[PDB]
Design a protein around this motif. Structure first.
Motif, PDB file in Angstrom:
ATOM      1  N   UNK B1033     -50.853  10.505  45.197  1.00  9.42           N
ATOM      2  CA  UNK B1033     -49.638  10.983  45.521  1.00  9.42           C
ATOM      3  C   UNK B1033     -48.393  10.169  45.242  1.00  9.42           C
ATOM      4  N   UNK B1034     -47.357  10.614  44.879  1.00 10.36           N
ATOM      5  CA  UNK B1034     -46.079   9.708  44.627  1.00 10.36           C
ATOM      6  C   UNK B1034     -45.404   9.275  46.078  1.00 10.36           C
ATOM      7  N   UNK B1035     -45.207   8.142  46.434  1.00  5.99           N
ATOM      8  CA  UNK B1035     -44.474   7.795  47.449  1.00  5.99           C
ATOM      9  C   UNK B1035     -43.235   6.896  47.009  1.00  5.99           C
ATOM     10  N   UNK B1044     -45.535   3.055  46.430  1.00  7.67           N
ATOM     11  CA  UNK B1044     -46.750   2.681  46.712  1.00  7.67           C
ATOM     12  C   UNK B1044     -47.922   3.807  46.551  1.00  7.67           C
ATOM     13  N   UNK B1045     -48.604   3.872  45.494  1.00 10.01           N
ATOM     14  CA  UNK B1045     -49.482   5.070  45.125  1.00 10.01           C
ATOM     15  C   UNK B1045     -50.513   5.155  46.196  1.00 10.01           C
ATOM     16  N   UNK B1046     -50.847   6.365  46.681  1.00  6.89           N
ATOM     17  CA  UNK B1046     -51.907   6.691  47.291  1.00  6.89           C
ATOM     18  C   UNK B1046     -53.174   7.634  46.502  1.00  6.89           C
ATOM     19  N   UNK B1047     -54.120   7.148  46.240  1.00  4.13           N
ATOM     20  CA  UNK B1047     -55.259   7.912  45.513  1.00  4.13           C
ATOM     21  C   UNK B1047     -56.214   8.884  46.610  1.00  4.13           C
ATOM     22  N   UNK B1090     -58.702   7.844  48.799  1.00  4.51           N
ATOM     23  CA  UNK B1090     -57.674   7.190  49.638  1.00  4.51           C
ATOM     24  C   UNK B1090     -57.313   5.590  49.330  1.00  4.51           C
ATOM     25  N   UNK B1091     -57.484   5.139  48.207  1.00  4.26           N
ATOM     26  CA  UNK B1091     -57.349   3.887  47.668  1.00  4.26           C
ATOM     27  C   UNK B1091     -55.919   3.508  47.737  1.00  4.26           C
ATOM     28  N   UNK B1107     -55.944  -4.819  42.858  1.00  3.44           N
ATOM     29  CA  UNK B1107     -55.981  -3.605  42.260  1.00  3.44           C
ATOM     30  C   UNK B1107     -55.438  -2.461  43.146  1.00  3.44           C
ATOM     31  N   UNK B1108     -56.281  -2.301  44.058  1.00  4.23           N
ATOM     32  CA  UNK B1108     -56.168  -1.191  45.210  1.00  4.23           C
ATOM     33  C   UNK B1108     -56.903  -1.498  46.427  1.00  4.23           C
ATOM     34  N   UNK B1109     -56.196  -1.501  47.554  1.00  3.31           N
ATOM     35  CA  UNK B1109     -56.678  -1.640  48.881  1.00  3.31           C
ATOM     36  C   UNK B1109     -57.315  -0.484  49.557  1.00  3.31           C
TER      37      UNK B1109
END
Ligand SMILES: [Mg+2]
Ligand SMILES: [Zn+2]
Lengths: 50, 1362, 298, 90, 49, 79
Positions: B1033-1035, B1044-1047, B1090-1091, B1107-1109
DNA sequence: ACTTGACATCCCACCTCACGTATGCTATAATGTGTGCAGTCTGACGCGG
DNA sequence: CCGCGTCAGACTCGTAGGATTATAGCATACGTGAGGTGGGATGTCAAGT
RNA sequence: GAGU
């Protein structure tokens, strides 16, 4: 059953039978009354430009 | 009629004729004016017996002179009215009707016998379509549906040979004609040639039904009811209210309708009524019948005249308000009284205040007997007259009876066995019962209007059991843990604390005293304070080895107070104990040590002493609670305003935009947590000490005497947290749900909160109280289920001679050694000797119960792992061994053979669940959890040594852990595993392997609310399958254009992005997959659901850059909320949502048949020739690299382990181990200590059943699920004689199923599924031999446990003698 | 069906006793444990003895501190009454009484309600005094109430300790309690729960129609249900005969209870059990369902 | 004892046995009017039975002993009576 | 209700767990004495007896 | 049954004329039957109310939980 | 100790009476309808399909 | 795997009081429970046995 | 409406 922010000035959040009745039965707050359509309402003071 | 067993089977219609004495032709009950029974009616005297004793209908014949007289005119037999409870009547049903129960209740034996679905049968029964019974013609055979004109198109062309019909009568016919014998044999022959899997399973089921049917001797035609039995009138009585009005049972109204419709059917038959209405009537007949048996099972039920559904026979048995639970397993009882409790400080441990008027009433009959024997009253009539006036004499006789009588006190809920205790009652004026303070803890009773029941054991035997087994003084120790229940509380503790606490100078500092008595003399003269530090000459006493007196005589340094207390202390206990300012802590320890070393009676007496003392000194001390007693810490507003101004700076620095939602939430919450703890400790310092007034110029300090603070430290009432809310800052609370509010309450109850703040707190309050209610019924129900399962387990044998056992460790679960070996094993029998290189090569003799002192010796040796003989590993049938169980915690000794250990365990384990719900739900008016899992901190100076991990060194220079299997331990001087910590994935380290850590240095570090995934290799981030909307999801904002990308996980994904596994691929400066050092993986880090991917596409990451939290919000239930169901589930053997998978036998495993990302494993055993292929999910994560030499029950998958699988692969001891520990983890979270042996009891009950491969001489064969007990009985008899052997495997059933599986069908019927269990046992022709508990309970017999052991074994030997 | 009826009103003067239910407005509640003679209770230096002694340990874990505030303000309210009562006994002049009273009302630097007396007639003045002779009634309204400092201020006007604690002499021994305790007036209430009603006991009385078990309630002279819970307790002990009592002689066994009654009078205490009626109820209902249950002989 | 029956408990062995064996002796006191060994001091048969077993003068085995003895004496004396009925029978 | 002089203190376990210690003076003054007006009905019915 | 039918049809009218209820005397007047007979019919008119009737407004009791058997001579009297 | 007979009061059974009860008969034409609330929970084991 | 279905859900006690119905009438035949008076069965007495 |  749980306590809604809307209950402010309308129902007492703090008056209810303990046990299985809890959350269901609640006393009308002091100044509060029913509006035209039987919806809950509270009297408030106007503040005009400060 | 002194009986052995109970058998249940199908009632034959002609057997129903047999029980029934007469046919009820008329729906009428009685005449409207003369309420005598009508002729052939529902309350008929001719059928059911005479209304009134020994008097017939017409009233010519009365008196005992006529017995068995049969009145010629009216046809009334002359006898006892009682017969109307026992004569059955009956109805001739014109249309044979099917029994609802065998249709609509699952599985439905009719349906399963005929392998026919429900709908078919329905349409048949309800006369919607015809069905083929017997087809001479090949076109159609058994069980074919024909419609209206299909039957005509069939009849017109064929007929003659062609047999079909409609309805229940047709089904009855098909039932008689189906071949019982042949089909069984047919099916096994079918099996002999070819058995595709699921087909063979259903065919197997059916075979079981059929065989069981013809062995029991139940005939299928009995499914169809011709004769309808009718319940005795007294059970459905018809009674007038005094106002003239009547009440009648619902049975009567259903029955009446039955008769009405049946009679109409007789009329319609004689009239030769057309088919349509005849069919309609048969529907109606069926309805009425099935409504009578079980109303509403069939769909829309018959209602009351009210609206309320009519109460059927089924309701009468089954319901919780049904006969079982309301009238059979429990009832109302006489010789009991109930009233309010009031304090009895003056009462002794084994006593209780019994109100005059209560006891007068209770003990009525005892009174009369002695009245007549002493001749005070001429006869019993005059004795009554003499009681009802009430003279001085009456009271004296009461006195004499009550003398040495024990009476039982009960409080609901019966949490555990000590919810009822026996006491010597002492008469007092007033209507209030007096209770002894000490025992309030066990009843969990408090004085705010609680009531208690007081029952009277009447017989000598009852009296005996009450005083001996149930007496307060006999039972101090919890059966649950070994520790005391009957103990100091509140005021007691406070007084003790007051006396033991020491004070600067005061009066008479540095006085030297000749013995203890002088101390008290000094206090009482006001020549010394009890707080005063003093030298006293005192002889401490010592136990010898044989038990003698060891007087030691010299100088002690104590307070006045402690000298007094040493007076109370019994002869032989060391001074060391009283030497310390006693709190709740010290108090309990004194008692404990005293019990264990000294013994029973002494401890009894001493405990009482301590009680009284406490009261006394609480009273002279004069402790109260004033407004200034709650001290607001000096620097409150300072520390608060600073935290507030800085938080304000970070909110303003929000608009600048280095502030995600996560970071800001984190930041706010953490600054507030740290500020409150600052406030807490300043408040505590202030309150804790504060004797810093000037010594004439300069100052001084000591431990101040603040009353609230004393209650805190004493453990009298307050704990630190409560104090905090009172004098400190109330803190943060929980919103409606999981949400934690940002701004906390800075104020205290001292200041008073306002509108807003008070309002805020209400949410949590209401939530808490609603939980205490509604969330506790779950725990109660759970407990009852446990109870029901755990009934048959009793000590039958001393030692069967098993060598088997379970290896118990000291539990070093992560952070510390939360429960050690000593605590887990105390009072258990050991199996085998354990060796360890130790102080001199340790060996410890087996079959030995490990007493406290044994334990002490083994403590010095420091053995780690101990095989202990377990309840589970017991050889004994139906029950366990004295040895396998061990100490009965409540008694202190070895358990008594015969005592029902099952219910013991259950009560102990149900008790706390029920408590730990109620308590933090009505005391913890808000919500929080200790989730600052920030930094690890090594306490004592030792070497750092790591087990199980593989890390990768970065640019900043941290030893970052990428393994799920990581622990961080501590080595001492000469090489041992002392301290243990648990570090999760992504945790930065400081010192790696080998290097020494100095004291209190930061060796590990990680941010709590955020698990980073960390790269092992370097280069450019390449994006794979992270498209916007499908998987991410584009933020994005303005400014320089940062985002900040949300998977997103499964919920927010559209239907096309279901299988898309989003990754971050590791490519280099050149493009190509840079490989992790030494291994083959092209580094593709699978970012989970949700990474939140901070580091976007185009920024060269260094080796170990995030890479992703991955965010995981642990709101923090704790409590018994999340705990309760988890516990319940382990006990119900419920496979969790993602079960992990294992390896079967040993040998080198390998891959082969790979689907897209669906892993496959072909395990071929190096020894075992066979290969086991098992498919693996795509999204499933694997722990294993490839070729390993595995053992059975090798864990490969991530997640919590499924109990069944563990049972199958590992076997008994390991599964049992897991249950124990995993359950115990929950209760350890709450700090409630319970012995593992109870958990063990349950598990053995859950192991009750096995599965047979291979025939004995008996009713076995493939896949039958027979009891473990019946398998061992077959063993004995067959091995000794020969015959063909049977192979078995053990099986696991949880709770409900296990209970329902046991061969005690009245037990199982009393539990749940009453309807179902009855039908199964009825078809089975099952015979209940009545060895278990509740069986005898219900029959009002002698329980086969304990006191009833003797009588019950006598009946068992009488079975052998013919 | 009813010929005639008479209603009768009983007037009971019901005196307080131990086991009655009492509480304050703050949720602090309790049962009366003992009524002590006046002598037993602690007394003031002044000689005024105490009325009720409430456990301080009921405070901290229950977290209602407002009752403490009420206690303090309550002593000072009565402290007002003390001084006024004294000047009433001492007659004196209208003016001086007026002064004291008004300076009292206008105590708060921050008060809303300003009752400047002045205009009031002599009648009304002495009248008012008489009324406040019993201790002056104050109004802290909810959340908008009296701060602790203003309470301290009034405790000076009551001429009593600002901390609201006083040293107490034990009326039994004469020994002082070593430290002062919080004393003062609090507003108590006696509940609708009277021990008089809560008392009830049953040996023998009316039994149930179908099951033949004892009835429920004080209304029927009913017995308590000894429930499955209680059963469990007995089972934990090895107590079989007590249990059997509860199951048979005490409930549905007619022949058994009557026989055991007679045995008790005779001094036997032998049980000799029978068959509980509930179990027979059970049998017959099962056979009504066409299910055959037979109890098999040995 | 009065307070704590633990000593008596220990003398027999099992708790349950103690209760039942004590009941049988207490019942004998009640029924037969059998004479209490230790001076009564108005204790109930609960306590009487407890005391006797406390000192160890009753045992299950000695209770059965007393039964065997008094039953043998009964048969000896009613030899005369049962012999007349017996001669009648054949 | 009515207002009394309370003293917050522990007594010799008469105030144990929220239990209350109280003066005879309360009965002396007749405070906390309830009037209860209880109703009973006597019914004369007609049976066919 | 037919007499009961008369009763209730008349009941409606009489309630509307009086503005209230029909006393047995006034009712008995209009029917020209003996008051005793009227009262008898009124009592007999009561339908079976259920023994299983939830007397407890809160599902506490099935009327049966009240009913006592006065047949039983009390153990007092049996002694 | 007991019987006999006379005279006077009480208990059992069968007959005429009167109200109560059971069932039939009615003719303009009348012909496809009733009816509600149940629910929201909630994890659960189970078969069916 | 979705389908829908099925089955569970604390302990004791305590307090208030039960009815609304729509419904034609009757002429006749048969049965069922009862009062009102005589025969038979015991009760009570006074002499004389 | 009590309390656990
Ligand atoms: Mg309570
Ligand atoms: Zn008859």
């Amino acid at each position: 059953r749980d306590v809604h922010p809307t209950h402010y000035g309308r129902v007492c959040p703090i008056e209810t039978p303990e046990g299985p009745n809890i959350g269901l039965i609640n006393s009308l707050s002091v100044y509060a009354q029913t509006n035209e359509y039987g919806f809950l309402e509270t009297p408030y003071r106007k503040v005009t430009d400060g | 009629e002194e009986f052995d067993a109970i058998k249940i089977a199908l009632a034959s219609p002609d057997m129903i004729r047999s029980w029934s004495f007469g046919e009820v032709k008329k729906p009428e009950t009685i005449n409207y004016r003369t309420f005598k029974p009508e002729r052939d009616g529902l309350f008929c005297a001719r059928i059911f017996g005479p209304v009134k004793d020994y008097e017939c209908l017409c009233g010519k014949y009365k008196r005992l002179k006529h017995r068995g007289v049969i009145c010629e005119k009216c046809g009334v037999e002359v006898t006892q009215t009682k017969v109307r409870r026992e004569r059955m009547g009956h109805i001739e049903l014109a249309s044979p009707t099917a029994h609802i129960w065998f249709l609509k209740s699952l599985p439905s034996r009719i349906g399963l016998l005929l392998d026919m679905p429900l709908r078919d049968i329905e349409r048949v029964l309800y006369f919607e379509s015809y069905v083929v019974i017997e087809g001479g013609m090949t076109n159609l055979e058994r069980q074919q549906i024909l419609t209206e004109e299909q039957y005509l198109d069939a009849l017109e062309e064929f007929g003659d040979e062609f047999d079909a019909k409609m309805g229940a009568e047709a089904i009855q016919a098909l039932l008689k004609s189906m071949d019982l014998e042949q089909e069984c044999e047919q099916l096994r022959e079918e099996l002999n040639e070819t058995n595709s899997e699921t087909k063979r399973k259903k065919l197997t089921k059916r075979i079981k039904l059929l065989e069981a049917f013809v062995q029991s001797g139940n005939k299928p035609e009995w499914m169809i009811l011709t004769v309808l039995p009718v319940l005795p009138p007294d059970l459905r009585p018809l009674v007038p209210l005094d106002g003239g009005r009547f009440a009648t049972s619902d049975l009567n109204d259903l029955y009446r309708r039955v008769i009405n419709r049946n009679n109409r059917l007789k009329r319609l038959l004689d009239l030769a009524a057309p088919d349509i209405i005849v069919r309609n009537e048969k529907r109606m007949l069926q309805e009425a019948v099935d409504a009578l048996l079980d109303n509403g099972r069939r769909g829309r039920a018959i209602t009351g005249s009210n609206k309320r559904p009519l109460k059927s026979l089924a309701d009468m048995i089954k319901g919780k308000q049904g006969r079982f639970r309301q009238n059979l397993l429990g009832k109302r009882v006489d010789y009991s009284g109930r009233s309010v409790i009031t304090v009895g400080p003056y009462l002794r441990l084994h006593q209780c205040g019994l109100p005059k008027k209560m006891a007068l009433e209770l003990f009525k009959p005892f009174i009369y007997g002695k009245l007549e024997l002493r001749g005070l009253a001429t006869t019993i009539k005059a004795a009554k007259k003499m009681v009802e006036r009430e003279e001085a004499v009456v009271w004296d006789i009461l006195d004499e009876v009550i003398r040495e009588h024990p009476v039982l006190l009960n409080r609901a809920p019966t949490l555990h066995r000590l919810g009822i205790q026996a006491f010597e009652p002492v008469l007092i004026e007033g209507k209030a019962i007096q209770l002894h303070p000490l025992v309030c803890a066990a009843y969990n009773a408090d004085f705010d209007g609680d009531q208690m029941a007081v029952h009277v054991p009447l017989t000598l035997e009852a009296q005996l059991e009450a005083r001996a087994l149930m007496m307060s003084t006999n039972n101090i120790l919890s059966p649950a843990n070994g520790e005391p229940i009957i103990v100091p509380s509140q005021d007691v503790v406070l007084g003790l604390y007051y006396m033991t606490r020491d004070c600067v100078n005061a009066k008479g500092e540095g006085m030297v005293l000749t013995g203890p008595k002088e101390a008290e003399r000094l206090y009482r003269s006001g020549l010394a304070s009890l707080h005063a530090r003093v030298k006293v000459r005192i002889t401490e006493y010592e136990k010898d080895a044989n038990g003698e007196l060891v007087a030691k005589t010299s100088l002690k340094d104590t307070t006045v107070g402690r000298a007094i207390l040493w007076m109370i202390v019994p002869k032989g206990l060391p001074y060391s104990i009283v030497n310390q300012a006693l709190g709740k802590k010290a108090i309990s320890k004194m008692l404990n040590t005293c019990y264990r070393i000294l013994g029973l009676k002494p401890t009894v007496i001493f405990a009482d002493q301590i009680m009284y003392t406490g009261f006394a000194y609480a009273a002279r001390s004069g402790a109260s609670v004033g407004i200034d007693d709650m001290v607001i810490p000096e620097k409150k507003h300072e520390i608060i305003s600073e935290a507030e101004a800085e938080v304000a700076e970070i909110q303003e620095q929000f608009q600048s935009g280095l502030v995600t939602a996560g970071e800001r939430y984190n930041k706010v919450i953490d600054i507030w947590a740290a500020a409150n703890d600052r406030v807490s400790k300043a408040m505590m310092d202030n309150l804790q000490t504060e004797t810093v007034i000037n010594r004439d110029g300069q100052e001084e300090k000591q431990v101040s005497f603040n009353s609230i603070y004393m209650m805190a430290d004493s453990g009298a009432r307050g704990s630190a947290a409560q104090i905090r809310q009172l004098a400190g800052m109330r803190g943060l609370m929980a919103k409606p749900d999981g949400s934690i509010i940002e701004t906390p309450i800075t104020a205290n109850f001292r200041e008073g909160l306002n509108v807003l703040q008070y309002f805020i707190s209400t949410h949590g309050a209401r939530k808490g109280l609603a939980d205490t209610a509604l969330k506790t019924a779950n725990s109660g129900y759970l407990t009852r289920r446990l109870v029901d399962v755990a009934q048959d387990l009793v000590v039958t044998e001393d030692d069967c001679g098993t060598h088997e056992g379970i290896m118990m460790t000291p539990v070093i679960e992560g952070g510390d050694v939360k429960e050690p070996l000593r605590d887990r094993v105390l009072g258990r029998v050991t199996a085998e000797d354990v060796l360890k290189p130790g102080t001199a090569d340790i060996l410890v003799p087996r079959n030995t119960l490990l007493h406290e002192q044994w334990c002490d010796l083994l403590e010095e040796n420091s053995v780690d792992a101990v095989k202990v003989r377990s309840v589970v590993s017991c050889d004994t049938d139906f029950g366990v061994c004295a040895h396998c169980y061990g100490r009965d915690l409540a008694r202190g000794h070895i358990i008594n053979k015969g005592e029902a250990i099952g219910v013991i365990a259950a009560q102990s384990i149900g008790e706390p669940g029920t408590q730990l719900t109620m308590r933090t739900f009505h005391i913890g008016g808000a919500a929080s959890r200790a989730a600052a899992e920030s930094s690890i901190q090594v306490k004592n100076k030792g070497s750092i040594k790591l087990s199980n991990v593989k890390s990768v060194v970065n640019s900043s220079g941290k030893l970052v852990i990428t393994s799920r299997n990581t622990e961080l331990k501590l080595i001492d001087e000469f090489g041992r595993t002392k301290e243990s910590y648990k570090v999760p994935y992504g945790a930065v380290l400081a010192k790696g392997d080998g290097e020494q850590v100095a004291g209190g240095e930061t060796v590990a570090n990680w941010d709590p609310h955020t698990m980073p995934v960390i790269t092992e290799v370097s280069g450019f981030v390449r994006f794979t399958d992270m498209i916007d909307g499908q998987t991410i999801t584009r933020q994005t904002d303005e400014l320089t254009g940062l985002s900040s990308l949300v998977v997103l996980d499964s919920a927010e994904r559209t239907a096309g992005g279901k299988d898309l596994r989003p990754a971050l691929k590791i490519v280099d400066a050149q493009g190509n997959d840079v490989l992790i050092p030494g291994t083959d993986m092209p580094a593709q880090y699978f970012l989970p659901g949700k990474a939140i991917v901070q580091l976007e596409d185009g920024v060269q990451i260094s080796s170990g850059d995030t890479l992703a939290r991955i965010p995981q919000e642990s709101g923090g239930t704790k409590d018994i909320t999340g705990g309760l169901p988890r516990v319940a589930d382990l006990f119900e053997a419920r496979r969790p949502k993602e079960p992990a998978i294992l390896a079967e036998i040993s040998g080198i495993v390998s891959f082969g048949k790979e689907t897209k990302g669906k892993r496959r494993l072909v395990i071929t055993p190096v020894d075992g020739s066979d290969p086991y292929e098992e498919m693996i999910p795509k999204w499933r994560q694997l722990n294993v690299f490839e070729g390993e030499r595995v053992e059975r029950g090798d864990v490969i998958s991530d997640g919590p382990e499924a109990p069944h699988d563990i049972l199958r692969l590992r076997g008994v001891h390991a599964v049992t181990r897991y249950i124990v520990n995993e359950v115990q983890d929950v209760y350890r979270l709450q700090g409630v200590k319970i012995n593992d042996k109870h958990i063990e009891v349950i598990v053995r009950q859950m192991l009750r059943k096995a599965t047979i491969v291979n025939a004995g001489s008996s009713d076995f064969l493939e896949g039958e699920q027979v009891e473990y007990s019946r398998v061992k009985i077959a063993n004995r008899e067959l091995e000794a004689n020969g015959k063909v052997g049977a192979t078995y495997s053990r099986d696991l059933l949880g709770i409900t199923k296990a209970s329902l599986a046991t061969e005690s069908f009245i037990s199982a019927a009393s539990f749940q599924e009453t309807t179902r269990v009855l039908t199964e046992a009825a078809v089975a022709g099952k015979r209940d031999e009545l060895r278990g508990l509740k069986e005898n309970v219900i029959v009002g017999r002698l329980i086969p446990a304990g006191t009833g052991y003797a009588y019950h074994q006598d009946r068992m030997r009488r079975r052998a003698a013919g | 069906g009813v010929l005639k009826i008479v209603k009768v009103y009983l007037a009971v003067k019901r005196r307080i006793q131990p086991g009655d239910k009492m509480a304050g407005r703050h949720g602090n509640k309790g049962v009366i444990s003992k009524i002590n003679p006046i002598e037993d209770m602690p007394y003031d230096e002044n000689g005024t003895p105490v009325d009720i002694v409430l456990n301080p340990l009921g405070v901290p874990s229950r977290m209602n501190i407002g009752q403490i505030l009420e206690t303090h303000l309550g002593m000072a309210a009565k402290g007002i009454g003390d001084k006024i009562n004294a000047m009433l006994k001492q007659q004196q002049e209208v003016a001086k009484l007026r002064e004291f009273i008004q300076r009292a009302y206008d105590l708060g630097a921050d008060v809303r309600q300003k009752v400047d007396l002045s205009t009031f007639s002599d009648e009304e003045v002495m009248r008012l005094a008489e009324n406040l002779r019993k201790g002056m009634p104050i109004a802290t309204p909810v959340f908008d109430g009296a701060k602790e400092a203003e309470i301290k201020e009034l405790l000076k006007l009551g001429d009593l300790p600002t901390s609201g604690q006083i040293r107490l002499y034990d009326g039994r021994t004469g020994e002082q309690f070593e430290r002062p305790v919080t004393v003062g007036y609090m507003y108590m209430l006696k509940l609708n729960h009277l021990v008089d009603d809560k008392m009830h006991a049953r040996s023998t009385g009316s039994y149930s129609l179908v099951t033949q078990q004892p009835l429920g309630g004080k209304a029927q002279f009913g017995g308590q249900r000894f429930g499955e819970m209680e059963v469990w307790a007995l089972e934990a002990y090895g107590a079989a005969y007590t249990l059997q009592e509860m199951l048979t002689v005490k409930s549905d066994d007619v022949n058994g209870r009557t026989k055991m009654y007679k045995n008790i009078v005779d001094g036997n205490h032998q049980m000799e059990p029978g068959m509980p009626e509930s179990f027979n109820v059970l049998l017959k209902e099962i056979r009504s369902l066409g299910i055959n249950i037979e109890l098999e002989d040995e | 004892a009065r307070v704590t029956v633990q000593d008596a408990v220990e003398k027999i062995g099992n708790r349950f046995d103690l209760v039942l064996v004590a009941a049988r002796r207490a019942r004998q006191m009640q029924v037969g009017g059998k004479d209490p060994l230790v001076p009564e001091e108005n204790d109930k048969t609960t306590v009487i039975a407890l005391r006797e077993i406390e000192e160890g003068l009753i045992n299950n085995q000695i209770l059965d002993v007393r039964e065997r003895q008094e039953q043998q004496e009964q048969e000896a004396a009613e030899l005369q009576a049962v012999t007349a009925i017996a001669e009648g029978r054949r | 209700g009515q207002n009394m002089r309370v003293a917050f203190m522990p007594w010799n376990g008469y105030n144990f767990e929220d239990s209350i210690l109280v003066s005879e003076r309360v009965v002396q003054e007749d405070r906390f004495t309830t009037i209860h007006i209880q109703e009973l009905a006597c019914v004369s019915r007609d049976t066919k007896l | 049954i037919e007499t009961i039918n008369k009763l209730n049809r008349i009941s409606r009218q009489m309630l509307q004329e009086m503005g209230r209820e029909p006393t047995p005397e006034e009712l008995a007047e209009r029917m020209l039957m003996p008051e005793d007979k009227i009262r008898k019919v009124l009592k007999i008119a009561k339908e079976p109310i259920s023994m299983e009737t939830p007397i407890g407004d809160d599902e506490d009791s099935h009327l049966g939980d009240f009913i006592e058997d006065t047949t039983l001579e009390l153990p007092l009297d049996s002694a």
